[PDB]
């Protein structure tokens with residue numbers, strides 16, 4: 748069945764859609780449909796390519812108002828590396844507070860964690876009732892369910908600058924060093940190659956956390 752609007756969505760609105768690359772891109776909502784229990788949203792991306800998307804695979808082209816997001820909220824966030832930016836789906840792990848210097852903590856669908864500001868976020872239009880249930884990587888899905896279900900119970904390890912620990916990376920444990928702590932994240936330096944990473948302090952990739960998981 749055809750629809751020309753659906754709640755707060757209207758045909759011809761600007762929107763973000765999830766492309767086949769798993770990154771999100773700006774476009775225009777050109778059609779809406781409802782077929783039995785399922786709604787889909789036809790998006791024309793700015794390159795004129797089109798995709799028929801479920802409501803959890805579109806996001807508003809605006810930033811969340813204050814107090815609209817909560818822990819567990821399904822969002823698209825900017826991920827920055829060098830001079831590049833990607834829009835990528837994730838879950839709000841923390842909302843702005845004194846402890847995190849008024850930032851949102853995002854757990855991206857691929858497992859990376861990052862503090863971001865409101866200008867770096869977009870709410871997903873129609874998240875699943877259990878927001879984690881569209882996380883494609885089942886290990887990430889299971890982690891998010893665990894995290895959100897326990898919250899605010901959050902087992903984390905206390906780490907200090909200079910501390911030497913082993914950190915897991917792709918199936919091996921590596922000699923590493925705590926370079927700095929930022930709220931619920933720690934920046935770990937791998938001593939073998941001097942590559943570093945921001946990791947959640949409740950991650951089982953940190954040896955002390957693994958041991959007590």
Ligand SMILES: */C(C)=C\C(=O)Nc1ccc2nc(NCCCCCN(C)C)nc(NCCCCCCN(C)C)c2c1
Nearest residue numbers: 826828835855857859916921937939940941942943944
């Ligand atoms: C440290 C002092 C500097 C450093 O290494 N910086 C650095 C800069 C940029 C980085 N980008 C990434 N990207 C990984 C993919 C992220 C995808 C995010 N999605 C949301 C789209 N990663 C790192 N570091 C990762 C850790 C690498 C550790 C290697 C350990 N060896 C033992 C193999 C990164 C780091």
